[PDB]
């Protein structure tokens, strides 16, 4: 086609989706990770994670308002990845890298798993 | 903070949101523009348009599944802007610029209004 493109559009959309999340506006699911709960938008979760894409395209699970993650999942690891989904920013630290990598593998977030593997290999 | 950032993340999220729209997955509103209907995600509309942000933060309108636009709104102009919302790509042409600019003013999409004004000024 002969389209023009607005460079910052995708980033601006994501910033507004994060603003809606922070204000709990039109959030439609709560992700339960042991004792912790995280409100989010199903569409954002599906757009970022192979696991959520699978869950919310399922004819029964698409209608659930609560999703319980595997008890082995670390809430802080999930929180870091949820923030990454809504911002493109990953708070990767020596103290959380193992939990972040395990959570990203479970959520099927290949690019995160990749940088975790690379950061771990550099420290060995 | 000490975060790392994945450059293509925002663009990849938007590509997946457009894929969900094309497959009518978790779309939660129909925008009626005279004889035409457009299925979309409320969160994407709010993230792109001052008008939709206002509409879906309203305590009554947030729950509506159908939104009827002003009869003066051109369906093709709306279609072009809806595509832009989900892709960052604007199909701006001599034959549609007036309709696109009028629709962008109504939807409160300032950056689109700006490029339309600039393209019009260059042709006079």
């Amino acid at each position: 086609d002969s389209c023009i493109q607005f460079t910052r559009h995708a980033s601006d959309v994501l910033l507004n989706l994060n603003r809606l999340r922070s204000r709990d506006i039109l959030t439609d699911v709560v992700i339960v990770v042991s004792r912790e709960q995280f409100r989010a938008h199903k569409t954002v979760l599906m757009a970022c994670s192979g696991l959520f894409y699978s869950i919310f395209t399922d004819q029964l699970k698409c209608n659930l308002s609560v999703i319980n993650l595997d008890p082995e999942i670390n809430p802080e690891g999930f929180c870091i990845l949820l923030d990454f989904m809504y911002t493109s920013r990953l708070n990767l630290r020596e103290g959380n890298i193992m939990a972040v990598m395990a959570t990203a593998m479970y959520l099927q977030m290949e690019h995160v798993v990749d940088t975790c593997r690379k950061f771990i290999k550099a420290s060995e | 903070d000490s975060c790392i950032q994945f450059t293509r993340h925002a663009s990849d999220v938007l590509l997946n949101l457009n894929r969900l729209r094309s497959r009518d997955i978790l779309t939660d509103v129909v925008i009626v523009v005279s004889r035409e209907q457009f299925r979309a995600h409320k969160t994407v509309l709010m993230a792109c348009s001052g008008l939709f942000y206002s509409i879906f933060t309203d305590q009554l309108k947030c729950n509506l599944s159908v939104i009827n636009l002003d009869p003066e709104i051109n369906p093709e102009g709306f279609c072009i802007l809806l595509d832009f919302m989900y892709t960052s790509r604007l199909n701006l042409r001599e034959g549609n610029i007036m309709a696109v600019m009028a629709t962008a003013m109504y939807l409160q999409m300032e950056h689109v209004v700006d490029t339309c004004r600039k393209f019009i000024k260059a042709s006079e």
């Binding site: 389209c3 023009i4 493109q5 460079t7 | 790509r89 950056h111």
Partner: peptide
């Protein structure tokens, strides 16, 4: 705005 750019030519993509």
């Amino acid at each position: 705005w750019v030519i993509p």
